[PDB]
Design a protein that fits this description.
The complex is a heterohexamer of chains A (7), B (787), C (361), D (209), E (84) and F (58). With 787 residues, chain B is mainly beta. Chain B has 6 domains: 6-67, Roll (Ubiquitin-like (UB roll)), CATH 3.10.20; 70-147, Ubiquitin-like (UB roll), CATH 3.10.20; 153-238, Roll (Ubiquitin-like (UB roll)); 244-320, membrane protein fhac (Ubiquitin-like (UB roll)); 325-397, Ubiquitin-like (UB roll); 469-783, Beta Barrel (Porin). The N and C termini of chain D lie far apart (63 Å). Chain D is mainly alpha-helical. The chains are: A mainly beta (7), B mainly beta (787), C mainly beta (361), D mainly alpha (209), E mainly beta (84), F little secondary structure (58). Chains in contact: A-B, B-C, B-D, B-E, D-E, D-F, E-F. Chain E: It is found in: Cell outer membrane.
């Protein structure tokens, strides 16, 4: 899967 | 009617003097009905008066004006699929905003504007209602209620007039979609004018790249169902006959470069007309002229078509313009990133002659960096110089930090977890700093990495890494032992050919081994290392510190990253322990992959993979048994259980740590063990050779609209691993594990595609040449795992 | 994640069956039309019913017990593996020993009623989305391009073509011309009723009867020197047969057809509001707001009662004197999208899954 | 959400002043915004606007402060307290500028605003602060030019280096960056083998240092 | 490894033969172009430098120095085909 | 924000004085163009925490 969220 | 004084009733915000100036009438002049009407109309058009009444008293011209209530707030309700801020921006661009006055007649206009916006975004049944809440001091609040409705989706794409290519094959390359399976990632099924135009251009290119020089799109039609929940697209086209290319002709002010240009316009007689090739020829001529100082080398191609023979002859008109020199290159919008970060990506030098190709390449490199959302260029002129310009790059800065967390599954390692946090533009200096971690059945890994991508102006990179690793052998289909290691590593990176890349570096690693199962190979390495452990229990321990020199070379030429159809990739890696360390050895590995297409459409391909490896010790010692090479499994030889090929362990008679019947043990002393003991559990070897030949074919049953998103292959794999130090003379009763001739072979079928869970790979293979001890696993799969 | 709709679906009316309806027989055809908006529907001629599906299968059934007579598939196949659908969309027409069907591939087939063998097949300008009206030895076709073509029924060779304008965005489906006094009156996707002489196709008149707002006519009707037309989102109009000058207007329209009986006009509004107007001035005699947004089908006047299907699969009888429901039935689960066919004392209707039903009382 | 009661303007303004003196800006901004919204033409709308400019600036709401300053300048070109507004505009641009390698456009804007202030009203009370800020900004811009020339020196572009150092000697002749950059010009001239020009640059360097 | 570094004006070897003593600045600029370098320290002198250094192949430069007079009339021409 | 608060609230820095450039004999320096010129403003006003920026009472 792999979720990626920018901070 | 002469006027002696002027009076107003209702002026709140507009100044009295401003109103007097605005009104053409002035005190001390004749006034008539026409003048009164003109003043009334001017006041109405002022945009701040709702009702205007110019009445005449006995002597004074009294005016009654009901100033339009001021807008104090605009509220939205139901904008589920529309951002409130963007809706406010659209409204203020339209004209309605806070602070201004509200017109009690343009409510319908505002509602219809919002409905038009909804129609544009996709919803055709959307409705908008406006509510007005008056408030004291001539104020008002405007509230909007939205019934979004249900969006309309594409229900069919039809092409009428295609007799050589099927509609399914043609629309397979479009951006617009009419079918989306739940098991693929092909796209969304919405309708957009830009996508429709792009699809028309794609269809035109598809036909022009095949020799249909007379292709023409007669028309296009878009229809909605009466309930307005489905969209039908039709494209009426007219494909002609296939044409041949008779020849080419070049003319214009070539500037004395005719001899060099003719070589770019050489073709084989009898070739089929192509469009991509013609564009490439034009681009080649443009680059040729740009290399000679010309900033705008204009080129146009005109085809002349003869139907009697069905042949096309090109006519290329070339105009090499004038020479322009760049006086400055300016970057604006880089509030965070420093100047050099953007400047070092430029292919063009300030203070040299101009090149449009170079400017475009610099823009493309800036886009590839990843620190910006948008990049724009603007080649301005310099006043007072007829041949000088200033290049300006305008960038909007993105946010470069991120978190990521991922989950995958597979037969190789079971459930796999990944997590990390990354910062790609540390303080706008370009340094990339991150910390990552991974966990699966048999190991846990954590690392902290810091990289400088431009240690030298040419692009040489300098990176550093700190890592901790924990490895449990018995969970990986090997003989039991535990290895906990940690260390640091520093590396340089040299680009040399835009396909080739070298790297060299140094590293330090500390390894701590425990819980080692007594066996001949491990106790052969330990003796060379100087240890003399006992062979009756697995309460062991052994620690070593090593400094190594690392090197590698990579060559990448694959045309595409996902489902490549042509190219090669070669990766050589090495390592050698430099003096002063506990372990003296060297290790080398070589990866090869090659694709060869056997068609013009690149649907039938041949893939060849190889994997070689060899290592050994130097100062009378041996390579550590935890550096071994493993074969088997879906990575190397499909159809075999992971890490099953190669030598097998041979144990000593030893007492179990905590004996308990009903459990299977490796011939422990408490089960009647009095001599050496064979096994079926792999240990690896220090030499490895693996090869695989694969044939990639179109998927047979899947619908042709999306059959290019699934890859189908038939494969044949060979592999072998061996231990060159195994002395067969001493152990005569056991197999010779130092023979390279024990080749394991399997054959079968495999499928790959991208799913909502990530990449999916499935394989079924049948190992038809295997040796005693090897464990077969025909069905293998991997779900969403890319780490 | 959630979804919503602007207009709430109307509830199923509760009525007490004055009489009990039945279902004499039901036969199956392969997959019907599905979710696609098609004009395909069965036809009756000489005690036998012809049906088809979008894939290409065409069947003839006995009108009394539903027994199959012949069946032929018009889908071309490149061997035993490849099979591309014919995409049949033009309603089945029968006249003079032929079965005419249009196709989304700009093809018109004329099969034989006796054997099911293709008598001829012609290529037209575009998708044949309309019922192939037959008149005076000609077969009129309204293609999706806005072109009205006239084929020969015996040869199949196009005689004349008339070009009509099309807007940027339209509604799916096309109007079927009606022939009266040696002239064909048709409607356009731009909201204009036009008349063409069938000898060559020369336009006689054409006028706007319309109010992103669209306006599409879809099959006017002609009686006693007058032409009644409906434009979607526009207005009903009864115009003269010679000059085309509007006589009277009513701000109500729809895409599905309407019927004219005696001195009354039965139609279904865009919002599924059944009405019953008059011919003199169109003053409404009654209305039914019980089925709003139920997606009704074209009304059919069977045994003196209007019959309409709906997407949910229910078939409703409604009186004509006052408009009060006289019977309600549940027939199919897939629903009804295409018009019912009433003729020769029979009422046949095809569901979205191809199941042709014969209903009785 | 920081709801403001419909109290009389005098009382709400007194509360706003008290909170400004206390030193909390978030609530004072809400009070002043509510007052302005409810009384678009109140007796002290101009005072509300000035207090709002001050509060937006000191609350780090620089875009809103800039919008308010622009509106105020457009509407009241002859307001006696306009020099205060131009000083505030310069301060806001310096704050946005906030790192000499980065974008100098805000430094240029601040320099323009302070120059207009000092050249228009030399008898104002903000003129000394304006001049000190002008000196700082001129040095910052010279430093940006020096950074670009220094990058091109390592890139190896010897015409860009001399052109940029000449632009420095022309625009910013009296800063430390120019003195630091003169050797870069000499090196570029020598690398292109223009010893005649390198000698002149060396003469300047020797005569100055 | 690295890209190619270009600097100065592009001299074709035909334009340089087109300039003769006695020409004005306008004529010289028309023939060759606006120089990327002049002399800012008083005297008027135009430097036409043509420097190119392709990818790790070596540097080649040509220099053309044009010395005018107070009235902008060419007085001296100096040509260096290659840099020592 | 965090970088911006320091500037917006209280920070103040004093840079080096601007000094003229000498021209060796036999040559001159490039022209100045007066684009970035600081006029001399006499007077000793407030600066650097001694100047109050609160709006005047008008």
């Amino acid at each position: 899967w792999n979720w990626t969220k920018r901070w | 009617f002469v006027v002696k004084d002027i009076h107003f009733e209702g002026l709140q915000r507009v100044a009295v003097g401003a109103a007097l100036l605005s009104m053409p009438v002035r005190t001390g002049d004749t006034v008539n009905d026409e003048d009164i009407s003109n003043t009334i109309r001017a006041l109405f058009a002022t945009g701040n008066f709702e009702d205007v009444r110019v009445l005449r008293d006995g002597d004074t011209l009294l005016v009654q004006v009901k100033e339009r209530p001021t807008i104090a707030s605009i509220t939205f309700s139901g904008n589920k699929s529309v951002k409130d801020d963007m809706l406010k921006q659209n409204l203020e661009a339209s004209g309605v905003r806070v602070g201004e006055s509200l017109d009690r007649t343009t409510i319908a206009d505002i509602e219809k504007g919002l409905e038009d916006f909804y129609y544009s975004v996709g919803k055709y049944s959307a409705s908008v209602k406006a509510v007005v809440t008056p408030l004291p001091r001539n104020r008002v609040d405007l509230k909007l209620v939205f019934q979004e409705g249900v969006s309309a989706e594409i229900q069919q794409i039809n092409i009428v007039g295609n007799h050589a290519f099927t509609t399914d094959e043609l629309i397979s390359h479009f951006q617009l979609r009419d079918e989306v399976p739940w098991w693929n990632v092909v796209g969304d099924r919405k309708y957009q004018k830009q996508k429709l135009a792009g699809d028309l251009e794609t269809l035109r290119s598809y036909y022009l790249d095949r020799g249909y020089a007379r292709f023409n799109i007669d028309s296009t039609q878009v229809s909605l169902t009466p309930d307005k929940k489905g969209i039908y697209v039709t494209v009426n086209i007219t494909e002609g006959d296939q044409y041949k290319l008779s020849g080419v002709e070049v003319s214009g002010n070539l500037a004395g470069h005719s001899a060099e240009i003719e070589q770019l316009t050489k073709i084989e007689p009898g070739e089929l007309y192509n469009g991509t090739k013609v564009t490439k020829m034009e681009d080649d001529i443009k680059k040729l002229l740009g290399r000679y100082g010309y900033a705008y080398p204009r080129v146009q191609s005109m085809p002349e078509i003869n139907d009697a023979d069905k042949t096309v002859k090109l006519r290329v008109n070339v105009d090499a313009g004038n020479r322009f020199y760049v006086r400055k290159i300016r970057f604006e919008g880089n509030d965070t990133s420093k100047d050099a970060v953007l400047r070092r990506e430029m292919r063009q030098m300030e203070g040299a002659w101009l090149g449009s190709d170079l400017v475009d390449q610099g823009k493309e490199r800036l886009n590839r960096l990843g620190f910006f959302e948008t990049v724009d260029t603007d080649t301005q002129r310099v006043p007072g110089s007829p041949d000088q310009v200033d290049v300006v790059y305008k960038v909007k800065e993105r946010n470069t930090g991120s978190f990521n967390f991922g989950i995958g599954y597979g037969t190789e390692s079971g459930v796999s977890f990944q997590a990390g946090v990354q910062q790609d533009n540390w303080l706008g200096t370009g340094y990339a700093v991150g910390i990552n971690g991974t966990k699966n059945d048999y190991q846990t890994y954590a690392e902290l990495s810091v990289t400088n991508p431009y240690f030298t102006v040419d692009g040489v990179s300098l990176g550093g890494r700190l890592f901790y690793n924990d490895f449990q052998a018995d969970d990986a289909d090997l003989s039991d032992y535990t290895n906990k290691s940690y260390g640091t590593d520093v590396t340089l990176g040299f680009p040399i050919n835009e396909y080739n890349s070298l790297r060299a570096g140094l590293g330090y690693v500390h390894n701590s081994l425990s819980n080692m199962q007594p066996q001949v190979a491990m106790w052969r390495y330990l003796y060379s290392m100087g240890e003399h452990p006992s062979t009756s229990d697995q309460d062991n321990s052994f620690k070593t510190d090593d400094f190594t020199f690392n090197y590698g070379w990579t060559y990448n030429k694959l045309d595409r990253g996902y489902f490549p159809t042509d190219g090669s990739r070669v990766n050589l890696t090495g390592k050698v322990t430099i003096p002063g360390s506990d372990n003296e050895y060297y290790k080398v590995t070589l990866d090869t992959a090659t694709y060869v297409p056997i068609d013009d459409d690149h649907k039938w391909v041949v893939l060849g993979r190889t994997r070689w490896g060899y290592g050994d010790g130097l100062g009378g010692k041996e390579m550590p048994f935890y550096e071994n090479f493993y074969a088997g499994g879906s990575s190397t030889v499909r159809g075999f259980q992971s890490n099953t090929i190669g030598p097998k362990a041979v144990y000593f008679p030893h007492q179990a740590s905590n004996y308990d019947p009903d459990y299977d043990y490796e011939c422990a002393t408490q089960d009647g063990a009095k001599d050496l003991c064979k096994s079926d559990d792999a240990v690896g070897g220090n030499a490895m050779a693996v090869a695989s030949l694969e044939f990639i074919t179109p998927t047979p049953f899947i619908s042709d609209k999306y059959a290019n998103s699934v890859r189908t292959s038939f494969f044949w794999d060979m592999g072998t691993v061996w231990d060159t130090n195994w002395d067969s003379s001493q152990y005569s009763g056991y197999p010779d594990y130092s023979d390279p001739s024990n080749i394991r072979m399997s054959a079968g079928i495999a499928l790959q595609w991208m799913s909502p869970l990530g990449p999916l790979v499935f394989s079924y293979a049948q190992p038809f040449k295997k040796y005693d001890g090897d464990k077969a696993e025909q069905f293998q799969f991997n779900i969403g795992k890319t780490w | 994640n959630s979804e919503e709709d602007v207009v709430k679906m109307s509830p199923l009316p509760t009525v007490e069956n004055q009489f009990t309806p039945t279902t004499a027989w039901s036969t199956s055809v392969g997959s019907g039309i599905g979710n696609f908006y098609s004009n395909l529907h069965p036809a009756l001629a000489d005690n036998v019913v012809y049906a088809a599906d979008r894939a290409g299968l065409v069947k003839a059934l006995n009108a009394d017990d539903g027994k199959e007579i012949w069946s032929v598939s018009l889908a071309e196949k490149d061997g035993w593996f490849s099979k591309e659908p014919a995409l049949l969309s033009g309603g089945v027409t029968v006249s003079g020993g032929h079965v005419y069907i249009g196709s989304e591939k700009a093809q018109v087939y004329a099969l034989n009623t006796s054997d099911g063998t293709v008598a001829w097949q012609t290529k037209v300008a575009g998708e044949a989305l309309s019922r192939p009206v037959v008149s005076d030895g000609l077969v009129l076709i309204h293609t999706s391009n806005g072109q009205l073509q006239a084929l020969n029924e015996a040869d199949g060779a196009v005689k004349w073509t008339v070009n009509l304008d099309m807007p940027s965005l339209s509604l799916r489906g096309e109007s079927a011309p009606t022939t009266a006094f040696g002239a064909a009156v048709v409607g356009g996707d731009n909201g204009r009723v036009s008349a063409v002489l069938m000898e060559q196709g020369q336009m006689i008149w054409q006028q706007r009867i319309s109010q992103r707002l669209s306006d599409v006519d879809t099959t006017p009707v002609v009686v006693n020197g007058v032409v009644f037309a409906l434009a979607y989102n526009g207005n009903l109009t009864a115009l003269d047969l010679r000059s085309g000058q509007i006589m009277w207007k009513r701000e109500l329209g729809s895409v599905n057809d309407f019927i004219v009986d005696g001195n009354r006009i039965y139609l279904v509004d865009q919002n599924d509001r059944v009405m019953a107007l008059t011919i003199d001035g169109g003053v409404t005699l009654w209305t039914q707001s019980d089925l709003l947004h139920r997606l009704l089908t074209s009304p059919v006047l069977y045994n003196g009662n209007l019959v309409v299907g709906d997407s949910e699969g229910y078939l409703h009888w409604i009186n004509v004197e006052d408009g009060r429901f006289v019977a309600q039935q549940k027939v199919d689960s897939s629903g009804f999208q295409t018009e019912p066919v009433a003729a020769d004392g029979k009422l046949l209707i095809q569901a979205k899954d191809g199941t042709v039903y014969s209903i009785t009382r | 959400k920081e709801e403001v009661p419909d109290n009389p303007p005098n009382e709400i303004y007194a509360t706003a002043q008290q909170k400004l003196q206390d030193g909390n800006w978030r609530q004072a901004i809400t009070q002043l915004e509510a007052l302005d919204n409810r009384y678009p033409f109140g007796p002290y709308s101009q005072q509300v606007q000035l207090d709002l400019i001050y509060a937006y600036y000191k609350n780090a709401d620089l875009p809103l402060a800039q919008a308010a300053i622009d509106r105020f300048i457009r509407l009241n070109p002859t307001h006696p307290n306009i020099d205060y507004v131009m000083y505030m505009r310069g301060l806001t641009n310096m704050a946005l500028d906030d790192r000499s390698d980065r974008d100098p456009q805000h430094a240029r804007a601040a320099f323009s605003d302070f120059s207009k202030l000092v050249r228009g009203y030399p008898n104002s009370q903000y003129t000394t602060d304006a001049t000190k800020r002008l000196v700082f900004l001129k040095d910052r811009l010279a430093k940006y030019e020096y950074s670009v020339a220094e990058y091109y020196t390592e890139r190896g572009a010897w015409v860009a280096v001399v052109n940029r150092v000449e632009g420095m000697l022309r625009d910013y002749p009296d800063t430390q960056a120019t003195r630091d950059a003169l050797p870069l010009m000499e090196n570029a001239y020598r690398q292109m083998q223009m010893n005649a020009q390198a000698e002149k640059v060396a003469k300047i360097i020797a005569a100055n240092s | 490894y690295r890209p190619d570094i270009n600097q100065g004006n592009y001299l074709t070897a035909n334009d340089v033969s087109k300039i003769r003593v006695g020409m004005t600045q306008q004529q010289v600029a028309y023939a060759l172009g606006t120089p990327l370098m002049s002399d800012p320290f008083g005297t008027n002198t135009w430097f036409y430098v043509f420097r190119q250094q392709p990818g790790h192949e070596g540097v080649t430069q040509q220099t053309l120095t044009l010395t005018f007079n107070s009235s902008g009339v060419l007085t001296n021409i100096d040509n260096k085909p290659a840099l020592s | 924000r965090y970088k911006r608060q320091v500037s917006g609230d209280e920070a103040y820095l004093e840079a080096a004085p601007l000094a003229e450039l000498h021209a060796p004999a036999g040559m001159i320096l490039p022209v100045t163009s007066g684009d970035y010129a600081i006029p001399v403003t006499n007077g000793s006003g407030a600066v650097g925490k001694a100047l109050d920026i609160r709006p005047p009472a008008q």
